[PDB]
Amino acid sequence: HMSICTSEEWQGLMQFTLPVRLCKEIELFHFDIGPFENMWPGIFVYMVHRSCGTSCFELEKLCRFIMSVKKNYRRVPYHNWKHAVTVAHCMYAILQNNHTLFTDLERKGLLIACLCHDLDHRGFSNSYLQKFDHPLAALYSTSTMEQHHFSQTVSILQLEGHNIFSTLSSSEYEQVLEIIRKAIIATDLALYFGNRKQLEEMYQTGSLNLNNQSHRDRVIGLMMTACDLCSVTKLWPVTKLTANDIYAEFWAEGDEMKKLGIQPIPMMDRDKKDEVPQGQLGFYNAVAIPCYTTLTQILPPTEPLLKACRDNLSQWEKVIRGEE
Template identity: 40%
Template sequence: MILASISMFVELGLVKKFSIERETLYRFLMTIKKNYRDVPYHNWRHAFNVAQVMFAILMGCEMKGTFSDLEVLGMFVGCLCHDLDHRGTNNAYQQKAGSALVLLYGTTNTMEHHHFNHSVMILSSENLNIFSSLSAECYSAVMNVLKHSILATDLSTYFQHRTRFFKLVESREYSWGIEEHRELLRSMLMTASDIAASSKPWEVQQRVAHLVTAEFLSQGDKERQELNLQPQALMDRERQHELPKLQIRWIADICLPLYQSLGQMNPKLSVMADGALENMKHWDSLARKSEQNNSSFK
């Protein structure tokens, strides 16, 4: 994954364009990897997968030209860094548990602020700063894109912005020359890459769904045992059998509308919606089977 990340930096033209020293890039990537925790889902592998999807979108869907090199740099590094030091618990949990992170960053985008700050801490270490050749102006521009990209991975941010994006695409009023529109597209591509597991081949989708579930259930256990709270369905060990039904809702309500809108904007991105629809069929047949099993027990 480290080697593949280096290849992607090179193929995106970032190493050359921003005179990134190879040794610094190696150290940076090794440090990023080390700063992900050993949790079931939000670990280095997830960060790598997100970066790989972003790479595929930028290179394979003729999207690279839509953005400046600085934006590509900020988004790609943003993908690698977007869940740094994740503890396997979400923003709602930080608030319920009154964690130190809430005291530090407040209740809006709590974890995402932490992921960004963690990235800044790594980037500002002298021998890890892959942005060191940038002028002061470019440095501050790339940090802005980085921050924006990481904060965009909070689904509550996605919900705030998606209606505007969908409308722009629907009415064909978007123009990537307009800064605000491009910023919106960057946000949507970050989310699309982050949740892309739902668009992948069924074997991958199923494996990832079980990893996410393992992490959610362990948060649910903590809520029940340590905070004396009833966890929501998704995180409730006693309702594990509802996974197929919950996956269908996750894909239909959150993933599919985004993939469809992106596909409308760029037909090459339709593969994401196609993959998600295919996975919904699989989850649906599992949901039916589990219903039949339940009724035969009664």
């Protein structure tokens, strides 16, 4: 039930080289993958190679892997291929700027997990599938989509000629898969609030210890979250755009509820469009800013994300006060 790429696709990938002019910009946090759709898979490989060295993975098995992932993203307005790459990029920037805080095994795991984190998203929220009464919530009933996303990854990983991790030891294999699982589950926004509070705590009392694996997992998790929301960290006109994308889904979900004579929350109601800027404000203020603030504290080199967030915040304020 997994979908595979054709030899044409993956072989195309292998032959791609990145234009020299992007080499610089790719290293920047606010870098936008938007205007380079064909290059997306190629851009992932590049990031893999630079982070983890050129022969970290048998290039052949890697390219098949990436194109198959692509094919299992659906054609929805936001939780799509583009999202997966954008998020994976953001993690690349994070890893790059903290290069020795993490292991080869973490960096392989995390870029992979990012690319895989929303695999086979249907544009329906966790709340929806549970609240009426999908076969998926009938299988995992906390963090529904996220457990599916991980299962999907594993399925793709177990496909013929696709196993990029094959040449690890079986102990290392079972570790990276662990890393990944925790990383993906962490993107359930429900878990983030608990997780950031815990971190907030540990940092403030100076009991945060990157040698303690449990702490490691929470710092990783926060990263995953930071990466997931990173649209808010692009330059205003990019962010503005990405917003319409996230809303299109929300309102498609809202519509599907209205069809069962159920009133959607205002966020998912396209008849409540003018409330949007305000909603951003709220989201930036209760979610985004706290996310990046805590990340910047733990990982000072990730400060530019926070800075870009704040700039977008005040653009939303300017929109509300009516100056855009």
